[PDB]
Amino acid sequence: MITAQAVLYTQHGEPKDVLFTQSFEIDDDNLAPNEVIVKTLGSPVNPSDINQIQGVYPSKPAKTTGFGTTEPAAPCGNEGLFEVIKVGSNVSSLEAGDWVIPSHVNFGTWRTHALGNDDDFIKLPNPAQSKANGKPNGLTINQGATISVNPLTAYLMLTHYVKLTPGKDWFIQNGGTSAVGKYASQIGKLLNFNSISVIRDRPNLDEVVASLKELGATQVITEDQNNSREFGPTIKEWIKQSGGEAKLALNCVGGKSSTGIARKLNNNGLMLTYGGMSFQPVTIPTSLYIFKNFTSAGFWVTELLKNNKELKTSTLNQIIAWYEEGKLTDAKSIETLYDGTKPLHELYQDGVANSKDGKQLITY
Amino acid sequence: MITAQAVLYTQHGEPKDVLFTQSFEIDDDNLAPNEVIVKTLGSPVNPSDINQIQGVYPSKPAKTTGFGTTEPAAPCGNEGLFEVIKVGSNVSSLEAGDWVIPSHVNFGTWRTHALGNDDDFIKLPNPAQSKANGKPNGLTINQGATISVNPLTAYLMLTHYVKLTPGKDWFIQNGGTSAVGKYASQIGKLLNFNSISVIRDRPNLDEVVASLKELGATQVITEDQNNSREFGPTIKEWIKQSGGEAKLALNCVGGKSSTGIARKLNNNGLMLTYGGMSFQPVTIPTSLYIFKNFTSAGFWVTELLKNNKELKTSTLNQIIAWYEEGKLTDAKSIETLYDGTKPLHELYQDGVANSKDGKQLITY
Ligand SMILES: NC(=O)C1=CN([C@@H]2O[C@H](COP(=O)(O)OP(=O)(O)OC[C@H]3O[C@@H](n4cnc5c(N)ncnc54)[C@H](OP(=O)(O)O)[C@@H]3O)[C@@H](O)[C@H]2O)C=CC1
Ligand SMILES: NC(=O)C1=CN([C@@H]2O[C@H](COP(=O)(O)OP(=O)(O)OC[C@H]3O[C@@H](n4cnc5c(N)ncnc54)[C@H](OP(=O)(O)O)[C@@H]3O)[C@@H](O)[C@H]2O)C=CC1
């Protein structure tokens, strides 16, 4: 018998108000033939996990009395890395010690353990296996725990919609310091796409600029430069002088920022909106649509991959391979370790409240 | 010799400030083998004509001294109907008496006559020719003079981007009382497409609503209803009962109106922005792109048909056919006849100033 903790809520609302920790037992001596028990190694706090709890995200786990609560309650978190503890008698896809991530969204990853079917998980090579397979590197906890959402988002947005000619074409993105932005920059470098990252100004601008260029951004500008009429021609020269064109814009901010990157694209440009950190709508001048044949669309990784395991697998394997080859690094996280001295849900409420400091990862 | 008049400007500005009339001569006796002389029957004042003169429209006539001015001057007007008066010794495509429209934009239609090559024009059937073919109707001056821009814009937006299932699917459009909106309603009913027209409220609402439904709108709502969450379910019920889906939105207003019509589309919807009469940008909530997979694109008939004679020809023929059969009616115009007593340019300046009254057509 295993005693586990799960972060739940009986009703939607702000994480700071509705989350709680529910103690529950998992019978490791009576697993159905296809069941598996996993122990969480780490799971992050992503904006979508929060919106899901708030009730403003159209994809969520059902509320049930399954964890032993009197009222129906839903679990939290959609991605994370777990270590397999035990498999049922008919399980062959997984075994003790394996590293896995949920095979689908809405599994609930903010907890110490989980009981599920073998098909509820996807196996990632763990360090022991990467070494035995002769790979140069093995995944870290954070890399495994954040491999499902942000890296695939960056990869698919950059390759699934418009073909950028290697060594010539460009994509421009705001939210340059975001985890997704950092993954996009690297993938751009790996695929040989040029790129402009737009970020908010800061006292350590120079340091962040060099850091993002190391990751792979060709040029880094501030939102003030993004808004500047006078600076505009300098950006256009970068594109024109490269021989390619700015064909794609990645927007996760909205507002003025989204207007600014759209204006930087060449005619027939495409913008993918995948986030709205400013809480401002996407505003595009009528002229961009008519005279520059601009197109504005959306991206939702959860929806793109829910019934396309093939595209998901192919994308995931590429990220894993780059991690094993030492060609990709992770958007780093501020890790908070659960040790039982502080209720689990509080560690997540803190991670939520401290999101502004950067990606939060609760570890176990 | 023929003494002609042309409305010109030597510098971009407001029509009321920079326009003037230039008298020039055409030698109807010295025609090159492939030249043609035509006299204008009528030409409209369209928003794009004005934007062109203002210098905020990226497609324009080269300034030249061809009309006998010392400083380079540009002509005005992009569409219109002309009657062929004389053709060169090598012209077989046109005969005296034929009706033609410019074959390309930027020809300058705000003038009494024009000398050009045969390939500078596209023949339309004149009344006698339509009649000799047993067609119920011949084209009127206004129908011929306004056939190049608004009707083709409406047709191509409804048929060239997303396929609406006849008898089922819907398109929604703002700017319902505009000439384009009136063509879209008619083309919509002729192709058996369902549609909702959005217009600004007015005291004679009932009459305008009835009028738009006769033209082809299935339903007509005000912008207030467009802004209404309360009203939302009513629209959704209309679509549900039809068994179809709202797949396309036509936007020529911008601002809140563009937001409102975008929201009423079913998931995977497409909006075509082709105008922005409110002078407000297209604003779309982040959630529509991500969760509803909405797409916002542009439309510019000038750019689309620029190097696509076949698509232009085909679309033009379908409009001519509907006029000849009597199935399509023109967005009516307020006509001002030039008789040589008031400078030609003033007639057009009045046309520009009285735009809000409705489509203006200067006749000859
Ligand atoms: N649609 C999809 O499939 C996916 C969408 N997303 C979206 O991406 C965003 C989260 O990304 P990750 O999860 O990569 O994010 P992180 O939490 O790592 O980064 C968030 C970023 O947003 C920036 N930011 C915060 N507030 C503002 C503001 N007011 N104006 C401009 N920028 C601001 C931060 O700036 P700074 O560095 O200056 O502090 C930081 O760069 C969310 O919008 C999330 O919902 C993520 C994955 C997938
Ligand atoms: N290829 C392209 O991209 C093309 C673009 N256009 C664009 O379409 C529009 C012109 O259309 P046509 O040439 O059909 O126009 P008209 O001038 O004939 O009609 C314009 C109509 O728009 C309405 N209108 C004016 N201001 C507003 C507002 N703020 N909100 C809602 N309605 C408003 C009027 O309403 P009411 O009568 O009720 O007062 C009027 O019925 C312009 O935006 C023009 O540039 C046209 C052809 C092609």
UniProtKB/Swiss-Prot annotation, chains A, B:
GO terms for molecular function: enoyl-[acyl-carrier-protein] reductase (NADPH) activity; trans-2-enoyl-CoA reductase (NADPH) activity. CDD domains: ETR. It is found in: Mitochondrion. Keywords: Fatty acid biosynthesis, Fatty acid metabolism, Lipid biosynthesis, Lipid metabolism, Mitochondrion, NADP, Oxidoreductase, Transit peptide. It comes from the Eukaryota. The keyword Nuclease does not apply. Its main location: mitochondrion. InterPro entries: ADH-like_C (IPR013149), ADH-like_N (IPR013154), GroES-like_sf (IPR011032), Mito_Enoyl-ACP_Reductase (IPR051034), NAD(P)-bd_dom_sf (IPR036291), PKS_ER (IPR020843). One of its GO terms (cellular component) is mitochondrion. Induction: Up-regulated by growth on oleic acid. Its EC number is 1.3.1.104. Transmembrane segments: none annotated. NADP(+) binds at residues 150, 177-180, 200-202, 274-277, 299-301, 359. It catalyses: a 2,3-saturated acyl-[ACP] + NADP(+) = a (2E)-enoyl-[ACP] + NADPH + H(+); (2E,4E)-hexadienoyl-CoA + NADPH + H(+) = (4E)-hexenoyl-CoA + NADP(+); (2E)-hexenoyl-CoA + NADPH + H(+) = hexanoyl-CoA + NADP(+). One of its GO terms (biological process) is fatty acid metabolic process. The active site is at 57 (proton donor). Belongs to the zinc-containing alcohol dehydrogenase family. Quinone oxidoreductase subfamily. Homodimer and heterodimer with ETR2. Catalyzes the NADPH-dependent reduction of trans-2-enoyl thioesters in mitochondrial fatty acid synthesis (fatty acid synthesis type II). Fatty acid chain elongation in mitochondria uses acyl carrier protein (ACP) as an acyl group carrier, but the enzyme accepts both ACP and CoA thioesters as substrates in vitro. Required for respiration and the maintenance of the mitochondrial compartment. This is Enoyl-[acyl-carrier-protein] reductase 1, mitochondrial. It comes from Candida tropicalis. The gene is ETR1.
